[PDB]
Amino acid sequence: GSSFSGKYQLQSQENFEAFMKAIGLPEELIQKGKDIKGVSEIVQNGKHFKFTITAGSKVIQNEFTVGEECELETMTGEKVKTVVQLEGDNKLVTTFKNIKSVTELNGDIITNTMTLGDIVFKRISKRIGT
């Protein structure tokens, strides 16, 4: 299975600044990063996932197997041990650092929602070729 596989780019986001402040992203990276339409690349092979998030020179590479312990490198660079689960046929769900993350794919649109307390940080991305 390779349902999530693809190359995607941010179209729009909500609450970037409030969320990144709350998690402790350096102010310099908040200000430089707020208008970056980052590129996300996902390679899925059954339960095994590799994903790359690129925003300028900043490249975050992660991998996990659904249902197994993984170590996810977050935006600050903090690495957190967690588990990513499938929810329904189109969602990837996990929690780290008290952040609830939901990644939902519908056709060529991926929506990622991260909520920390009352702060909801929503990203909409669109497939950009192969």
Ligand X SMILES: CCCCCCCCCCCCCCCC(=O)O
Binding residues vs ligand X (CB under 6 A): 29, 32-33, 36, 38, 40, 42, 51, 53, 55-58, 60, 62, 72, 74-75, 84, 92, 94, 101, 103, 110, 112, 114, 123, 125
Rounded distance between C-alpha atoms, residue 27 and residue 117, angstroms: 21
Q: How far is the CB of 58 from ligand X (least distance, A)?
A: 4
Q: How far is the CB of 92 from ligand X (least distance, A)?
A: 4
The helix/strand/coil state of 97 is: coil
Give start and end residues of each alpha helix (H) in the chain: 16-23, 27-33
Q: Which is nearer to ligand X, 58 or 127 (CB)?
A: 58
The helix/strand/coil state of 90 is: coil
